[PDB]
Amino acid sequence: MSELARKLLEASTKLQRLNIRLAEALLEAMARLQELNLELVYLAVELTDPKRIRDEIKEVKDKSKEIIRRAEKEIDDAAKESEKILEEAREAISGSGSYLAKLLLKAIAETQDLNLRAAKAFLEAAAKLQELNIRAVELLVKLYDPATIREALEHAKRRSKEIIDEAERAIRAAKRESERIIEEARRLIEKGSGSGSELARELLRAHAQLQRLNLELLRELLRALAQLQELNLDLLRLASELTDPDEARKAIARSKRESKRIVEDAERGGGTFACRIAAKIAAEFGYSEEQIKELLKNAGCSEDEARDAVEYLRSRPGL
Numbered sequence: 001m002s003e004l005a006r007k008l009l010e011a012s013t014k015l016q017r018l019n020i021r022l023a024e025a026l027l028e029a030m031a032r033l034q035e036l037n038l039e040l041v042y043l044a045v046e047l048t049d050p051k052r053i054r055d056e057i058k059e060v061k062d063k064s065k066e067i068i069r070r071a072e073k074e075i076d077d078a079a080k081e082s083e084k085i086l087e088e089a090r091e092a093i094s095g096s097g098s099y100l101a102k103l104l105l106k107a108i109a110e111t112q113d114l115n116l117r118a119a120k121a122f123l124e125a126a127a128k129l130q131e132l133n134i135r136a137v138e139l140l141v142k143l144y145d146p147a148t149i150r151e152a153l154e155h156a157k158r159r160s161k162e163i164i165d166e167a168e169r170a171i172r173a174a175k176r177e178s179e180r181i182i183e184e185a186r187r188l189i190e191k192g193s194g195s196g197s198e199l200a201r202e203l204l205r206a207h208a209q210l211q212r213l214n215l216e217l218l219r220e221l222l223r224a225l226a227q228l229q230e231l232n233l234d235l236l237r238l239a240s241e242l243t244d245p246d247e248a249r250k251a252i253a254r255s256k257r258e259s260k261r262i263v264e265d266a267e268r269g270g271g272t273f274a275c276r277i278a279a280k281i282a283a284e285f286g287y288s289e290e291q292i293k294e295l296l297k298n299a300g301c302s303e304d305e306a307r308d309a310v311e312y313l314r315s316r317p318g319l
Contacts, residue, residue, distance in 0.1 A: 001199065001285050004093060004101040008108065008203055009285070010298060011089035013278050015082060015112050016210050017300035020271035022078045022119055023217040027224070027270065029071040030126055031263050034228050036060050036067075037133050038259065041235060042252050044137050045245045057138050064134065068127045075119050082112050100189070100200040107185045108207065111178055115214050118174040122221055125167035129229055132159055140240055149240045157233050164226050171218050178211050206281045213274055224266040231255050231262070275301040279309035280319060 040060045047053050086109050093101040136156045143149050182204060189200045235255045242248040275296050282292045289310050296306035313319050 004096060004098055005199055005203060005285070007089055007092045008101065008104050009206065009282070010295065011085055011105070011108055012207055012210050013295060013299035014085045015108065016214060016271075016274060016278070018078055018081055018085070019115055019119075019214045019217055020274060021300070022074060023221060023270055025074045026071060026119065026123060026126075026221055027263065027266055029067050029074075029123075030221070030225060030228070032067050033064060033126065033130050034232075034259050034263070036063055037130070037232060038235075038252060038256050040134065040137055041239055042249065044141050045239060045242065045248045045252075047141070053138075053141055057134060061134055064127075064130045068123070068130070071123055071126075072120075075116065075123065078119070079116050082116065086112065098196075100192075100196055103185060103188065104200060104203055104207070107181050107204070110181050111207070111211055111214075114174045114177055114181075115211075115218075118171055118215075118218050121170035121174075122167055122218055122225070125163050125222075126225055128163045129160060129225070129232075132156060132163070133229075133232055136236060140236065146240075153233070153237055153240070156236065160229050160233060164222070164229065167222055167225070171215070171222060174218065175215055178215065182208050182211075202285070206285075209277065209281065213271065213277065217270060220266050220269050224262055227262045228259060231258055275299075275305040275309040276312050279306075279313055283313050283319060 040056070043056055044053070047056065086105070089105055089108075093105050133156075136152060139152050140149060143152065186201065186204055189197050189204065192200075235251060238251050239248050278296060278299060278301075279292055282295050287295065292310055292313075293306050296309055297303070301309065
């Protein structure tokens with residue numbers, strides 16, 4: 001189609017793989033944080049020793065901050081690799097004198113920076129809920145009066161939803177700013193005639209399709225975070241309604257099972273179909289099977305996934 005068009009698509013798919021991997025890591029870290037919160041609730045049912053509870057609270061705090069600091073590292077690692085991928089792309093584009101190649105690439109760079117800022121916004125909401133969830137346990141173990149216990153639970157409920165609501169604002173801002181980047185670039189292209197302008201419009205539509213999956217990554221993470229935090233508040237509500245702790249321990253067991261089902265619901269999406277979607281995009285640009293398999297391999301698809309994606313195109317004639 002053009003060596004510069006192939007380079008742009010190669011940047012976009014590689015950037016999508018990066019985002020998939022980052023979303024998997026953020027999901028993992030959220031699974032670890034949840035695993036700690038459930039464990040902390042379970043021990044707060046048992047322990048009454050004042051010296052001991054302060055030690056275990058401190059240790060889950062330090063353990064949480066390590067999880068969060070290492071997830072911040074994956075984001076920053078993804079930023080550096082994003083800048084390398086865009087640099088190999090720019091090395092071919094910047095020196096070619098193609099106004100359309102440079103325009104598309106600026107649209108890819110701006111869009112990828114949005115995705116990273118949105119990933120940071122999500123992680124910050126996960127850290128805030130964790131700190132909230134630790135403080136909630138810490139205050140619940142010292143209180144006995146059911147009114148002050150409930151005041152603390154109602155406060156955790158309110159702050160949780162404020163925290164999650166601002167995370168859902170940031171993703172909605174990432175969405176609206178992604179479309180504005182596209183619509184600006186589209187309007188600039190549509191003034192053109194000629195095969196290079198129509199190719200650029202085509203690449204813009206392929207970009208929009210890939211950005212749709214990048215944004216759904218973040219939505220899937222946020223939905224799992226919200227569902228996990230509803231379990232957490234519901235469990236804190238119940239774990240202060242304990243006479244019988246043997247029943248409190250099994251409400252935790254039930255909460256561990258559903259937490260795993262929620263995390264599982266997110267694992268099953270999260271880029272499962274990216275290798276086929278890219279395969280479809282490349283076929284519409286007229287790639288040969290060898291060219292599609294090279295594109296998927298360089299976009300971090302396994303050999304299982306790439307072979308499956310090309311076999312998938314041929315299994316449905318008319319794609």
